[PDB]
Design a protein around this nucleic acid. Structure first.
Ligand SMILES: [Zn+2]
Ligand SMILES: [Zn+2]
Ligand SMILES: [Zn+2]
Ligand SMILES: [Zn+2]
Lengths: 585, 186, 396, 187
RNA sequence: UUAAAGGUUUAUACCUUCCCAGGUAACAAACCAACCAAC
């Protein structure tokens, strides 16, 4: 018994071929079944033939006989079809509205989530359809994770290095940071978890959260979890106010948070607020000055990943009292100096997936870029707040979409908050970058920030770019550009100080070869978000859309405090780089 | 069963028969007006029969379908329905002793064991602050469940014994607050 | 052969008037099959026969209870009613009487089986129903005796037990009399010949047992259902010690059942027009219907109200989904209408009104939730008393 | 019921009937016409009542032998389950200590109640209160049934381990008291 | 008002018998399902 996802009319009919089984009114379910291959509709009991040894499940071929369902051959003499009069017979038949067009619902329920158009439609359909599409995409991703084979420890070559045997008949998932495995240990009649792992090409090098002496028999599987249905909208309807409601601003503030004070007032002047903070602009500083500006406010700091919440907690240790902050940890090492699993304190830091059902004065959702509509719906369901502050940057990296193969996801389609920020503009903007040298700030501001990002520092004259295609080699799931590594080697020999730099590349195998040959620390752009370094050496390693993505390139080049050297393969962004060009030796 | 073509056919047959009767035409001619009339209901009393069975058949299936839905969802919310029903009955009961204890539970005070009814056994009650101490504890006496219990022990949360008179308004922010008061029934 | 079995012990879940954890026996399938194939034909004759001392299988509806009472009153000279209840019928029955019950049931096989076959059937019965092993809480214990309620032949065996206790009480009473003060020559000759037949005759005497059976049937009339009994007896013979009274019966239970019966388990009645005080937890009222006076069974209204207030399952808390439960309760509580006290009939009126209320609620919910109507016309009869008057009226 | 050989009989009968009715020749010639279709509507009656009552019995026969096959398969399933249960429970017999005793019987027959009394390698005792515990299972080892048994494990009604030091007179009221104590046959 | 009887087939109408398919009502028997009461 439920409500139509297209009409909200009460109806207890759910499509059986849909993975999420959405409730569908008689007219809507009829249109869905007649227009798609989805011929199974489920009710409190399934609409299936009650014949012993029959396989008919097409509702269009079923008849209500006696008090059961039968096919034509097995039906009793007295029956009527369930699928007739432009509707599928079911409960709540009279109370039904129907939909003029069901094309969006059909496309969402039938798409395989491999085209950019699917995500665009998901982020542009109705809010109920947004929730339906988010559930469908997340369930499809979870199911696709199961299609990968199991990797089993066949030989322990050394510590942090392994030998894996893969199951036959199933594909092998890519060996990068985006695929986190989990180890299972052999026991008598069951299996026991041994924690979460990540794998890279060695033999294979494994990075585990906790170190063991694991032997032959342990295997690794990408753990999947149940996808709970969504009810809350991705965004609560906007309410704008004439006075600050539910908040009492402090009468004494420091100069450290003064520049944000006016924006803080706007936080109290509207129901939800969206903030765009470029790299090095003080996003966590904003989030914590919001708390210090309203000392009596009840605040829930939340984020998708543990790292962002831990960064918020680290800032809280710096400015917020330790007795009024608590970190929620579900029953992975995280922030462990706030009291654990306390809800009724003043400031609660928690991940989206573990957020309790509670009310708050302010809910601060940091790093909106990685967020999905599923996360927004969960946050809106768990947290009832007078004000919401969405902090992040659409010009930075979003959540990876594994199933996407055709098309590129634009920042306006990352999520609902990102869509608002890219269509109407952010409610607040942090226009001063304290991290990057003026060259990097100018480049990124002209690239993705519409020339609105200003540089706090002066030009460091240490920003260099080089145009060098090199040679591109491909492994099972990554790309390697050894000539670019050789160019970096020559630069390091001619500039030994640059040996304090951190190598950043969009490919994990590129990072592995760079660490093996250069010795510098290596970072993928995806893992580099939220970090900062004095000197950066970045190699594009390709000219593919992955490496040429504007958000990814922005994030990669905004990691430098002082200097950066870009060995670039794309002519476009190389010309866009406001760096000092260097010649190939 | 008026919206069927056989109804129109039967109406035409009845009109022809009425005309024949009011006219008195012949004896075989009006027989043809009933040789083709009582058959006209022989395909009218039947096509209005199985559909009339079907209407009540859909009714007497969809009704047990509702009943199945109610049965399957009623037993899915028992943990909340029973407790809400319990608290409604509790509040309707209107007993001073139960009301005192339910208020104590709702703000600060819950026991640590079953409250005994003998005048000899012991009770341990947690007091979270000093405000609830004001209402409940007045000297050596403890009022709880409409009963008096002499105080013989009170200990802060970190298991350090604290005497009775030590607690007051301003020296109260010096102890672990979830106090455990041991008392004996009067 | 012999086939030992295991019977599981089960904790019943039902309403009762005393905090006693009554249990039941899940006997295994071999015994069920190989006792069914035998007592099925033994017992289907008993369950379908009317007018006999054993009353099992006969309904109280459609004037059945009145017919039972009239049969109990079959030509009793100085009629009085008497009832008893054994303290622990099932857990104190001595082994010999259980063997006797099985034997007098197996007597009906003089043709179909040889003697050794009868002996082996009896051996299997005493091996899996009398002194078998019971699994209670994942452990095996030996049952010292008693009877296992959960077999196919518990009620009828208890009927045989009750009949035996009554007859032996009668004999013990009659041979305890002085015999010189006794006035009737026929009865004195009966006493002398009974003594001779008991302690001086090695064989059976058909003539005297027929005569003695006729004597009891004339003067001591029983009606038996499982362990419950109702007897109509001659006052003069009881006063003179010619038939068993409550005292002799108590003595018999004391020396042949290892248990003492108290007065709370036995009742007497000097007025036969009131009916027996209690039978199968059903009280009797003599009332008027259709130019005729008949006896109607009425239950304890407390039991009916407890059934209404409390249920078994959580889904059973909604009256709408299940109206027939209140319907059957209404048939069972209908004879409360004729009771002189107002509250007993008030319970029945409450149930009628509340059936009507739940029918209205069901119609309202279904119509609001599904805009179709199916309230029909037969449902209206469920809150009308004629449906309940015809149930107890003797034409079906 | 359209692929029957008589559907052609209706086709021709009704076609000719309506053709000559629209022709309207005469009743003398239409008598044979109205009789041909009259017997044709009976031909269908015969050879259609001969068929439409057959699929009912055929369908019910199908269902019957289907459920009969299902029951027969369940029969094999329970056969396998029973046999494997017997063979799994027999493997615990500890097939040495029982052989010595059974060889001592004059005919091989021994009362069942002594098989666990003399051959079972584990004992469990259920104790209602500490007082009876003192009389039976005091100390780290005790005797019963002409044998010596050594304690290893003690649990309460809540199936949580209880240490032998915890069972005192004063500490007893803090324990669930159908105590389970298991011991091993010492040798 | 019009010799009689007999004769044949056909058409019409009436009545009777049987067969056949349609529907209504009743009765019973079975199976299945839910629920109640008694020991
Ligand atoms: Zn709809
Ligand atoms: Zn579907
Ligand atoms: Zn079928
Ligand atoms: Zn026999």
């Amino acid at each position: 018994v439920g409500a139509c996802v297209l009409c909200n009319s009460q109806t207890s009919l759910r499509c059986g071929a849909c993975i999420r089984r959405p409730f569908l009114c008689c007219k809507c379910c009829y249109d869905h079944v007649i227009s798609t291959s989805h011929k199974l509709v489920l009710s409190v009991n399934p609409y299936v033939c009650n014949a012993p040894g029959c396989d008919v499940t097409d509702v269009t071929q079923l008849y209500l006989g006696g008090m059961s369902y039968y096919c034509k051959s097995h039906k009793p003499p007295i029956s009527f079809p369930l699928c007739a009069n432009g509707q599928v017979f079911g409960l709540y038949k009279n109370t039904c509205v129907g939909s003029d067009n069901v094309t969006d619902f059909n496309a969402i329920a039938t798409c395989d989530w491999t085209n950019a158009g699917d995500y665009i439609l998901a982020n542009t359909c109705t809010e109920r359809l947004k929730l339906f599409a988010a559930e469908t995409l997340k369930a499809t991703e979870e199911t696709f994770k199961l299609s990968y084979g199991i990797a089993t420890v066949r030989e322990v070559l050394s510590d942090r290095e392994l030998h894996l045997s893969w199951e036959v008949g199933k594909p092998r998932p890519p060996l990068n940071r985006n695929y986190v495995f989990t180890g299972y240990r052999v026991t008598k009649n069951s299996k026991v978890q041994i924690g979460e792992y990540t794998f890279e090409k060695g033999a294979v090098v494994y990075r585990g959260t906790t170190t063991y002496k694991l032997n032959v028999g342990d295997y690794f599987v990408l753990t999947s979890h149940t996808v709970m249905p969504l009810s809350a909208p991705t965004l609560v309807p906007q309410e704008h106010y004439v006075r600050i409601t539910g908040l009492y601003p402090t009468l004494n503030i420091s100069d450290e948070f003064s520049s944000n004070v006016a924006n803080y007032q706007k936080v109290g002047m509207q129901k939800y607020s969206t903030l765009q903070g470029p790299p090095g602009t003080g996003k966590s500083h904003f989030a914590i000055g919001l708390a210090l500006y309203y000392p009596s406010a009840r605040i829930v700091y939340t984020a998708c990943s543990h790292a962002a919440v831990d960064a918020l907690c680290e800032k809280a240790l710096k400015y917020l009292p330790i007795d009024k902050c608590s970190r929620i940890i579900p029953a992975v090492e995280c922030f462990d100096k706030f009291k654990v699993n306390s809800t009724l304190e003043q400031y609660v830091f928690c991940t989206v997936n573990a957020l309790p059902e509670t009310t708050a004065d302010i809910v601060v959702f940091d790093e909106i870029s990685m967020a999905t509509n599923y996360d927004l719906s969960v946050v809106n369901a768990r947290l009832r707040a007078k004000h919401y502050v969405y902090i992040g940057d659409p010009a930075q990296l979003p959540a990876p979409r594994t199933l996407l193969t055709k098309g590129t996801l634009e920042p306006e389609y990352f999520n609902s908050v990102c869509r608002l920020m890219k269509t109407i503009g952010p409610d607040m903007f942090l226009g001063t970058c304290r991290r990057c040298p003026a060259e990097i700030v100018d480049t990124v501001s002209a690239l993705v920030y519409d020339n609105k990002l200003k540089a706090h520092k002066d030009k460091s004259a240490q920003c260099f770019k080089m145009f060098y295609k090199g040679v591109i080699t491909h492994d099972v799931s990554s790309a390697i550009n050894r000539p670019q590594i050789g160019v970096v080697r020559e630069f390091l020999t001619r500039n030994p100080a640059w040996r304090k730099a951190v190598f950043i590349s969009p490919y994990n195998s590129q990072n592995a070869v760079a660490s093996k040959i250069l010795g510098l620390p290596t970072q993928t752009v995806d893992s580099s978000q939220g970090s900062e370094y004095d000197y950066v050496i970045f190699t594009q390693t390709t000219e593919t859309a992955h490496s040429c993505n504007v958000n990814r390139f922005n994030v990669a080049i905004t990691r430098a405090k002082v200097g950066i050297l870009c060995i670039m393969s794309d002519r476009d962004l190389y010309d866009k780089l406001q760096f000092t060009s260097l010649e190939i030796p | 069963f008026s919206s069927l073509p056989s109804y129109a056919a039967f109406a035409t047959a009845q009109e022809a028969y009425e005309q024949a009767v009011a006219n008195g035409d012949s004896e075989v001619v009006l027989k043809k007006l009933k040789k083709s009339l009582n058959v006209a209901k022989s395909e009218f009393d039947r096509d209005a029969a199985m559909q009339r069975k079907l209407e009540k058949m859909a009714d007497q299936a969809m009704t047990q379908m509702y009943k199945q839905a109610r049965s399957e969802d009623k037993r899915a919310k028992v943990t909340s329905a029973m407790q809400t029903m319990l608290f409604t009955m509790l509040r309707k009961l209107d007993n001073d002793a139960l009301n005192n204890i339910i208020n104590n539970a709702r703000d600060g005070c819950v026991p640590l064991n079953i409250i005994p009814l003998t005048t000899a056994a012991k009770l341990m009650v947690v007091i979270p602050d000093y405000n609830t101490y004001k209402n409940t504890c007045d000297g050596t006496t403890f009022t709880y469940a409409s009963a008096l219990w002499e105080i013989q022990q009170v200990v802060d949360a970190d298991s350090k014994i604290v005497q009775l008179s030590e607690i007051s308004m301003d020296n109260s922010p010096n102890l672990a607050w979830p106090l455990i008061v041991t008392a004996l029934r009067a | 052969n012999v086939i030992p079995t295991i019977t599981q012990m089960n904790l019943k879940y039902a309403i009762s008037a005393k905090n006693r954890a009554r249990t039941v026996a899940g006997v295994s399938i071999c015994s069920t099959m190989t006792n069914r194939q035998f007592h099925q034909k033994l017992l289907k004759s008993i369950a379908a026969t009317r007018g006999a001392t054993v009353v099992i299988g006969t309904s109280k509806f459609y004037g059945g209870w009145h017919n039972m009472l009239k049969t109990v009153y079959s030509d009793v000279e100085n009629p009085h009613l008497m009832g008893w209840d054994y303290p622990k019928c099932d857990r104190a029955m001595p082994n010999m009487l259980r063997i006797m019950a099985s034997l007098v049931l197996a007597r009906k096989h003089t043709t179909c089986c040889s003697l050794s076959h009868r002996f082996y059937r009896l051996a299997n019965e005493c091996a899996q129903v009398l002194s078998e092993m019971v699994m209670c809480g994942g452990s095996l214990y030996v049952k010292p005796g008693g009877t296992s309620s959960g077999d196919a032949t518990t009620a009828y065996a208890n009927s045989v037990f009750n009949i035996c206790q009554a007859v032996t009480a009668n004999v013990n009473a009659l041979l305890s009399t002085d015999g010189n003060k006794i006035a009737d020559k026929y009865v004195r000759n009966l006493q002398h010949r009974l003594y001779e037949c008991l302690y001086r005759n090695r064989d059976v005497d058909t003539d005297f047992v027929n005569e003695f059976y006729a004597y009891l049937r004339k003067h001591f009339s029983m009606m038996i259902l499982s362990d419950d009994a109702v007897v109509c007896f001659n006052s003069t013979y009881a006063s003179q010690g010619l038939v068993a009274s409550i005292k002799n019966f108590k003595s018999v239970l004391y020396y042949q059942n290892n248990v003492f019966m108290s007065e709370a388990k036995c009742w007497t009645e000097t007025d036969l027009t009131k009916g027996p005080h209690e039978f199968c937890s059903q009280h009797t009222m003599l009332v008027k219907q259709g130019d005729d006076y008949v006896y109607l069974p009425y239950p304890d209204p407390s039991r009916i109200l407890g059934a209404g207030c409390f249920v078994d399952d959580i889904v059973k808390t909604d009256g709408t989904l299940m109206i027939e439960r209140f319907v059957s309760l209404a048939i069972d509580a209908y004879p409360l209408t004729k009771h002189p006290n107002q509250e007993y009939a008030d319970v029945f009126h409450l149930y009628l009104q509340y059936i009507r209320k739940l029918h209205d609620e069901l119609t309202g919910h279904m119509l609001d939730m599904y805009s179709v109507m199916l309230t029909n016309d037969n449902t209206s009869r469920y809150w009308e008393p004629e449906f309940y008057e015809a149930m107890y009226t003797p034409h079906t």
